[PDB]
Each structure stands twice: as structure tokens, then as C-alpha cells.
Amino acid sequence: GWGSIFKHGRHAAKHIGHAAVNHYL
């Protein structure tokens, strides 16, 4: 199915998916 290499499941779900910036809440 989803061959997502941890891309859409460990990253960017970060640096934005984390906080639109990475942190700063």
C-alpha cells in the first residue's frame, strides 16, 4: 500500500505538522 518511507509518518508530520515551525507551541 503506502510505500511512504517513514516520510508521512515521522517527518513533516513535523517541522509543521509539529508546530507550523517545529516548536514555539
Side-chain angles (χ1 to χ4, degrees):
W2 294 97
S4 54
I5 43 169
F6 304 92
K7 193 86 176 55
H8 295 130
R10 197 173 169 169
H11 191 93
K14 195 142 172 181
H15 297 333
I16 165 151
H18 256 205
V21 183
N22 170 20
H23 303 301
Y24 191 78
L25 172 51

